[PDB]
Design a protein around this ligand. Sequence first.
Ligand SMILES: [Zn+2]
Length: 1793
Amino acid sequence: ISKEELIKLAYSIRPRENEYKTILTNLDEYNKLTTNNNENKYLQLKKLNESIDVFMNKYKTSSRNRALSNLKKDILKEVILIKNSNTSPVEKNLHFVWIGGEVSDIALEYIKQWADINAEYNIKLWYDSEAFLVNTLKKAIVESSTTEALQLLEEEIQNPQFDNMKFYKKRMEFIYDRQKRFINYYKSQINKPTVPTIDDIIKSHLVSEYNRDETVLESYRTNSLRKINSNHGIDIRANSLFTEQELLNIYSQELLNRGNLAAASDIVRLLALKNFGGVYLDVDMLPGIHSDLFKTISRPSSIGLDRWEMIKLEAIMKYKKYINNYTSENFDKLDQQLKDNFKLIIESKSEKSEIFSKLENLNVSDLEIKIAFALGSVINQALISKQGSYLTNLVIEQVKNRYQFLNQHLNPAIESDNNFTDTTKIFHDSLFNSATAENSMFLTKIAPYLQVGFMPEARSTISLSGPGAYASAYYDFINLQENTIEKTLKASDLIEFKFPENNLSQLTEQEINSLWSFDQASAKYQFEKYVRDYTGGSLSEDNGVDFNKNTALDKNYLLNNKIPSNNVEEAGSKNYVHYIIQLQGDDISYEATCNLFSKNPKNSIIIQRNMNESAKSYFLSDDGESILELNKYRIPERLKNKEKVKVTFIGHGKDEFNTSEFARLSVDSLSNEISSFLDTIKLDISPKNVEVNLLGCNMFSYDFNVEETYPGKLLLSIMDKITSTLPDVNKNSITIGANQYEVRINSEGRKELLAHSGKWINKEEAIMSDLSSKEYIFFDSIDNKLKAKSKNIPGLASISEDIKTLLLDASVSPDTKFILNNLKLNIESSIGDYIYYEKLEPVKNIIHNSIDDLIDEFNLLENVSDELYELKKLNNLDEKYLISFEDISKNNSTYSVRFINKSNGESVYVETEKEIFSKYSEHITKEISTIKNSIITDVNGQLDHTSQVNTLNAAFFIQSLIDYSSNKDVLNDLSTSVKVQLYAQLFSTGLNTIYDSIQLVNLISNAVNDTINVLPTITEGIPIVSTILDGINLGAAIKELLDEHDPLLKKELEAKVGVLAINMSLSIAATVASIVGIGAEVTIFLLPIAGISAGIPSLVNNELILHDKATSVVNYFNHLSESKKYGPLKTEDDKILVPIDDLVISEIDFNNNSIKLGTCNILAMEGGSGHTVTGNIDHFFSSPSISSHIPSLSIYSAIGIETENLDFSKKIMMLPNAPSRVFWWETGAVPGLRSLENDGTRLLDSIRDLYPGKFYWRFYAFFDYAITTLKPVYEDTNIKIKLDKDTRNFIMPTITTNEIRNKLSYSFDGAGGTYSLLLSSYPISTNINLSKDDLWIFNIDNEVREISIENGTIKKGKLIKDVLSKIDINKNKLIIGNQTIDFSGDIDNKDRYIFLTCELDDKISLIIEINLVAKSYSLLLSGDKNYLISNLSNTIEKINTLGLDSKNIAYNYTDESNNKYFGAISKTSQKSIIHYKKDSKNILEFYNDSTLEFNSKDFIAEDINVFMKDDINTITGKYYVDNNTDKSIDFSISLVSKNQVKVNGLYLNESVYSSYLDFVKNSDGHHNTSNFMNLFLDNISFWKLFGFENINFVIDKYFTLVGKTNLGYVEFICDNNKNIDIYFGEWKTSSSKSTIFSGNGRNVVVEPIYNPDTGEDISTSLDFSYEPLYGIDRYINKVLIAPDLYTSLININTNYYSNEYYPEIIVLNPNTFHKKVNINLDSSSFEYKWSTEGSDFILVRYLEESNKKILQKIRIKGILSNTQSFNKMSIDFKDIKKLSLGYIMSNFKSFNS
Ligand SMILES: [Zn+2]
């Protein structure tokens, strides 16, 4: 009913197809106008359905096919809706048919029951008034012909070994010739213009050529015309039933030519319902009984279901009568309590009115026709149909087409007047020349058409005017097709056409007898009566030989005749014990017991029960050569463990149709004997099942109603009496077989027969018929009724194969040829019925094989998919309704499925009775649980993936479901539902635990758009070894470290997993080299503190006084002048530029070579009275210095300032320690010191001269006055430092007084160079402007160590604890106690780092690699290798002393002459590896403390990487085998001892893995373990990459190997014990991929490659060959090829003869829209044999090449399940192409299994 939905629901990248446009048009026109009624609605979707097929077959690879096949599923639903729509009562008519003669009084009483209860309806019994002597004629011909055949073979008949078929054949020859005489006599009296009625011509023919009288015959016509008319009679010739001539011809063909009144009746049935209302019944039917009549009565477990329905009818008629002599025989016996109960419940009702049910008004459709059922198949004993009902026409259309085919071949055969023998030979040859694959079974079913009704085992009526035509017409209506010959019916579709059970009452005394088929079983006794009447004779089948001569076993005869001269060997498994029991003392049963024992003398025993007292169980001993004896019916020891109990009772039987007495034992008489023998057996064996054989004359296995028939009556008695005696015997695993003969194979190879004659004779037809007639009856699994297990399919084939070779040769009777041919066809027809009736159940292995588990999963998915689609369709759910399998609740009667709305986050619940969702729920949650519980551990978490052992199996199916829901793909809905469920389970609680709408939407969204990989996919390079440590898989983490290329993210990972990978880049080695060298230079030479030269101020009462005396002040100006005369900076030791002490430097400019000076001032004075100067001495009258309200004087301005063009050649420089300031000062009475001459006095005079009347420091004013003190006030200043690209080294001045220090602040401006700054013990504010984030080194020597001042200089001491225990890092600011370095001009440069350095030792340097952005740091050591290793124990101690927390320490050092050293150290355990390249060859050393625990003077490898983590070290790299570039090996290596080296895992490329596979091929010693993998390294000479030869590697438990074939990869794992096995393998060909994974067993799953982009065309082929299985063929159990909808071709290349073992290839049978699917084998048709194990078909190829036996088995699952699946298949060979499986069963040799 999909309208606009289908389009856009079925998209393909291709433009809209032409035929698809037709579908859309037809799909619309069915929805555009849906006006009632139904017949038009049916034909329209029939157009649509056909329209789809036209497309789906033209564009097989189109992406629209999946959704169009969905529509067809919906269209099939539509046909059902249309049918059960128009529910209106059917017309009021009952139809019965009696044609050919006089209606029996029995029938009339049956019909009278309906007319009385259903007075509403009026019975219109049909009859052919022109033909009342047809039945009278058939008898006349049969009787006359029977007598003719008897006289023809009168001599032959007296022979006991005379097959009764030569009679029936010779008779049929006479029947036919006598029939033609009538047909010709008829043809000669119809052409005449005067028209004589049919039985009028019959009357003339009977009295002429036969001994009849017209007066008698005409009397039989009169009283059969009034009798039929009085009893609701209506003529067929008087009403226009045969308005169509084609039907009258068919009817007349069955009425006149062949004496088939039954087949003629079938034609009248259909037409009566085509013209009138539809309720048809037979004369053996009865009205339905009320379901309340026997409601209170329980059903004994002694009688069958069918018999229970019989006795209910029988209980009525015994008193209520309604029948003259109704037989209540089965009801009479032994239950008086229930016999009295039935009487009252019937006597307590109104007479006849309420005894049965009433049809009332039966509502049927204008289309449908309802037919009665019988044991799962349709039968036309009851019919219901609207007039001209659509299906009623289909049955008629069927019948016509059946006869159209029949007569097309039969008429030309019949036309040429030949005898029966040659007429049939023409017909058969005519049939199987037009034979196809679709009508093959129909042909063999209509081949004995002429013989029908005159020869046994010939039933063509069924396939022409019988149930076969009905069933075919049903399939026609259901699947919207026309003219189906023989296609399967599913009982789930038959139910809606089933006749209402409350009205049937099918089982009746007459109906039971009408079901007795005309077989060779009944032909046995009917023939006997013919001879019994022809001659006054006697019984011979028992009489004549049946004696009491109880001969005991001749041990010599049984050992040196029977056992050795036996030629019969059975292929069935010998796990069984056989109880051959002789019941009678004739010489016939004796010779039989000795022969049956000879077949398997080591499994069977002999018990001559015929001797009641001396009944001992003879058998062959544990050894041969003698027959040991043993009383008490028991068995030897070796036959006690047997699973199967086989028992054969040998004895003669009563000469009666359906015998009731076997060997003078009644039904209940043998049961008491079986019970009084079974108890004696229980002490030796407790079997799982039992098989009861009954051998002897007149012992057949009947077709219908085996219940109420020996030994069907016997199985009931034994069943409950054997299941309580022998435990472990399934309630229904009890088979019983009735055989008549015993067969041997003589010295020439011909099957022989032990008849009552007492001699073994060659009666082929008797033997072959008996072997094929035998059946095994058991109890139904559903406890329903008694069913017969299907015969051995390769068995019946083996029989027909024997028949063919008999028919092939010329030395065999034409009489026997004819019968064996009819037998062959009957056998061939039987095999075909098993596929048509769906009687073949799937294989149930004794043990749950691993391959079956897979098959049950693929099948499970297909069911849950379709059932979900049907569930969502019935309940109208869009694409926004996600099913929650976690929420399949179970109400009282139905389940309750939750559907989460993906849009609003709400959920809706729907109820279904289907338990498929419930079961898939349990399985899918279990799998998901297995996945989550494989992602350990709990503490750390989001990918971990610590997969192991079996957990891959769950991971496979889930991952295969996840990937189906590829991003931005619509279907399947199921695929996403599991993906969401899994997602919710991994990152949240259960999906069933989430009710929040907003949460659900966001979850489902993220679940869909993210990608989850629960399945490990193999990659090139180092394999991931699952070695758990500290909650992290180190092997997994390492693999990421090799693959992560962003050096930062690589460092980020190292910080997380606590793993240190060593760096070998020469860029880092050089960087470190420059850094360590700078620190060493700067930290060694000691320098003075500020300020020993200028003088350190001493605070006194809230003001700073720099100097006390005038002499001290002059000295300051002396120092100040001395300074700026040598320049603003001083050079010392030709190493460092030091500024003048207390000289205010405001700005240093390196790239321009200039300096800015700050403000250094001194207060001015004012207003002197009298000024004179005499001899450099000023005289005054007290000029006061302001204190202070007057402008300041510049001290520096008077000094020789020299700013520009300085020599900044030196890289090392001391930082200025002088803040800008203004000097407060006063004068004091100072005597003497006149004409004191210093460079400061001159400078002081330079201030005096430059500043007239503003400054005077020494003067006379009635007293000698001079500048007494000098007290400064510091204003905080900033020293901006402008750098160049050149490298600059800086030292921070150590300032004692806090007042001076706090005023200072530094500002650096980078320029892409190397800058270093030695930190002072006393913190000075600093800020750095990062340009290019160039090299910035910081020596923390003075802040990490203990510091004190000696004679004005700094002395570094011991290290202070916990200094670096607290380090603060930010992109804008770095804090290391005590200094705080701010960072401005911050380029957010992720790349470049910051370095901290200090000297732990004279030669050992520590380096801290810091990233501002990353907010973290790393540790590094530099120095001499040998010296470090020695002092390692205590230098690692130093690092812990400082407070550094880094778990691992890197080692980088460049030596003199430029040779570099690399390595890493673990802070704990003190283990370290060191690598370097001396003389171009690689050298690595493994150290533990000061001990060398491994060495390698030469290490041949590339891409070398060293990893450190606690005790564990890992070395990766690529190695070349035998120095060959193609031979590439990637290795994971752990160093442990001086000699032994641990191997973690290996990777092998195509060339090396081929060397491995070849090594593995010849590896089997046959068994030397565990030195296997150690031996491969010996072959590869893996030691040769190391230096020395004497090495022993160790293979870890978690060792992981991986090789690369040209199709994929295979990853091996070492098991619990050291055993190598396949963990996970995956290779893809052009069309498909194969997957093998640890858990599912050792199987390979072949799946078609799924392309994500759906729109593009899909592949329609699968490819398999044994070639990818080379070398690893020992690791593989079986191969499972699993195709999908888009698969029609399976290419299997079977000519790869390089493997010893070939896995069984199992091909699954999925549903497909394709018409045909093919398996193309690249081998010949011969070399192949076929077999059958349950539902699946088997082809096995045997070939002998290179002195090697080759057996290639191929099993196609469940093909024989139904006709639909059986005809999908075709098989291609190199010689013959396109072969049906039916053809293969016919032209290939079969074999048992
Ligand atoms: Zn007998």
